[PDB]
Write a protein that binds this ligand. Structure first.
Ligand SMILES: O=c1[nH]cnc2c1ncn2CCN(CCOCP(=O)(O)O)CCP(=O)(O)O
Ligand SMILES: O=c1[nH]cnc2c1ncn2CCN(CCOCP(=O)(O)O)CCP(=O)(O)O
Ligand SMILES: O=c1[nH]cnc2c1ncn2CCN(CCOCP(=O)(O)O)CCP(=O)(O)O
Ligand SMILES: O=c1[nH]cnc2c1ncn2CCN(CCOCP(=O)(O)O)CCP(=O)(O)O
Ligand SMILES: [Mg+2]
Ligand SMILES: [Mg+2]
Ligand SMILES: [Mg+2]
Ligand SMILES: [Mg+2]
Ligand SMILES: [Mg+2]
Ligand SMILES: [Mg+2]
Ligand SMILES: [Mg+2]
Ligand SMILES: [Mg+2]
Lengths: 200, 198, 198, 201
């Protein structure tokens, strides 16, 4: 699956119907992917990952900063699987930040599960695989919460995708605009005024 | 507020994108309202409820059996609020069933919790009865409200989702007692509507 | 057997947890934290599917005190049914000591009585004798709490916690209909007994 | 501030057979020491205490990698709930560090900084880190640690928020590790002799 496909004409949800931090009132336009939906999709993602990988030991690789929330949850759903079955893939965790250079011999001969928040141009993820592959892992797969439909796309496809979204600017669930909106659990769309108020 | 509106054309979601009980694979057509959406909407609902009804003892009245999942979830969210706020209000629970011990309601704020409202015959019958016991207040929260030409014109005080005239199951809503054990709201397929057919 | 909570188990200071402010002067200690309750229920859910996860389950909810343990255990069982290699169709019904009605729907099915607390056992004798009237294929009993109390037959099939002969409240367990709206199981204080006394 | 849940030296824990446990850690653990849910209920409260102290200005939450990641996520999740269930709410931004230091901490400046750590033992690590953070001129620094060890090696450093105060026992789970093992565990637990001899560095 290309994930849950969200279409260009997806209206999303009025912010008045949800519980949203008062400080981001005028800063968002719509709720775009309810936190809940992100959980439900993630649950299925974790099963899909377990079907494909466990399998063997896994080194779960979290791409900070925007990846931390998906990573956390996904792992929790995996852990939930590891403790209600015979199928118990043991798993160590690791962290990288990519500002495009890194901030790893552990990966050598390992099954690595890269966990990212969003692929847009796919440039970041190409930089990541090449860096990682230099450490000769056994296998490498990518999980991305979001994959943008974009002309800018070189066309790297993640192994695991939560949602396929338009090229709107979305925030929340650890996806930031200039370090803001991470403290929000739904994925939402900035307002013009939000883009302006928090411009760097 | 009419709540989250779901249009007559919303396709719901492909079942393969979600975790679904294996015994219901062929019986459902789509995931209609994802569990997590129910939660997010319920969370707000609880805050909305707590605005109108706090400040006096609330009796939460679950309408069996379909109302039990909403009731439990809604009330966990309410309690989540009540234990993280300067002052809070006592709350008692009670249960009712309508087939086709209430002086405990007098003077209190009654909050009837229901799964779906359709013609609204059901709820108007309950309200008729409840009101005889002189509650201070009565509000109804229903997860679902069906747009239907058969509606007598009852509207709840609290709505989660407004949905089309389609037959839905899950999140405690049944078809011939089935699909109660399923946390998504979903449309039941024909190849399963006849399978559980009475 | 269950989680054996010791007679001299101190519990936890209320000021270390989040407690609804209206019950602040009414509780002595937190006895069984909400989350310990959840974790052990998760485990029970796996046991229930281990013993009965190979046929139709009818889960019976004993109102009122049972509604939370029921919601939660069924939620954990529900998580098993879509994530694991074993999937058991499940229907629910609710009884209060009637109740529903109809109960013929039990015949030839696996039946799981879900109860808050087994003290004397008289409540459970009654439900076990009831359910056996409709010739089920198997009756099993899950009870969250079992008191180590003198009272004189059946041994619960699935037990969350086994506790001293202390009066406890919360997690839908009550004292005079109060404390049902508390997520933790706590020991009532002597001032709490006095304020909500009948 | 308060020492959090004081768990005694002779605390027995809970038998493993009573909980849901990863099959691959079955024999490597002795007891469940702090059930995941107990961590949760304690964390819910710690969140409110944090907000009562720090909620007056922009909070930057600083996660101490790697064993702090679980605590951090849950604590923030609670803090977020408080923030979106109130008309009053301050914005919150996040950052990370692993300890030399790994991982622009300038986002700390002028802000209310909440450091989130898994465990304080000798206390050297926290003092070392505060040495760094303090010279990014935050408005205020506060440390929350899920666990604090009662050890005679305690250099004297004490945090501001404590989940639990534990005995001098090697504990794993909830991201806390033993040679990178046991991070993928819900509960905080005590390693058996087999698991300990298994993974020793
Ligand atoms: O809608 C969006 N919201 C927030 N950020 C967005 C969005 N679209 C692209 N980006 C930037 C994502 N970029 C990630 C940069 O890292 C910032 P992080 O530490 O907050 O995760 C690169 C994606 P790609 O073009 O495939 O290499
Ligand atoms: O789409 C549906 N799914 C499931 N059940 C549906 C649906 N529509 C009406 N119902 C039945 C609801 N009717 C009552 C059934 O509820 C009893 P239950 O909770 O034991 O299943 C009456 C609604 P109204 O017309 O407003 O008085
Ligand atoms: O600590 C306690 N808290 C609350 N209730 C307690 C307690 N101990 C016994 N009980 C009485 C519970 N009984 C059920 C409660 O009464 C009706 P309710 O569940 O609707 O509140 C059953 C116990 P038994 O038949 O002797 O095995
Ligand atoms: O019981 C334990 N379980 C796991 N780890 C333990 C334990 N006790 C000390 N440690 C080592 C913790 N050290 C910090 C953690 O190591 C880096 P990590 O948390 O990213 O794996 C020392 C803290 P301090 O002595 O106050 O400078
Ligand atoms: Mg990113
Ligand atoms: Mg960025
Ligand atoms: Mg109904
Ligand atoms: Mg019906
Ligand atoms: Mg009972
Ligand atoms: Mg009673
Ligand atoms: Mg550490
Ligand atoms: Mg370590």
């Amino acid at each position: 699956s290309p994930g849950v496909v969200i279409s260009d004409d997806e209206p999303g949800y009025d912010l008045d119907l949800f519980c949203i931090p008062n400080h981001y009132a005028e800063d968002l336009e719509r709720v775009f992917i309810p936190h809940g939906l992100i959980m439900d999709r993630t649950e299925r993602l974790a099963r899909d990952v377990m079907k494909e990988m466990g399998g063997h030991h896994i080194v779960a690789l979290c791409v900070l900063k925007g990846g931390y929330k998906f990573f956390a949850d996904l792992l929790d759903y995996i852990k939930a699987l590891n403790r209600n079955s015979d199928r118990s893939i043991p798993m160590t965790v690791d962290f990288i930040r990519l500002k495009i250079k890194v901030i790893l011999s552990t990966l050598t001969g390992k099954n690595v599960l890269i966990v990212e928040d969003i692929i847009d141009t796919g440039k970041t993820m190409q930089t990541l695989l090449s860096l990682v592959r230099q450490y000769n892992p056994k296998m490498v797969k990518v999980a991305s919460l979001l994959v943008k439909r974009t002309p800018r796309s070189v066309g790297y496809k993640p192994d695991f995708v939560g949602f396929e979204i338009p090229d709107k600017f979305v925030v929340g669930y650890a996806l930031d605009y200039n370090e803001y909106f991470r403290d929000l659990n739904h994925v939402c769309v900035i307002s013009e005024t939000g883009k302006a108020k928090y411009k760097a």
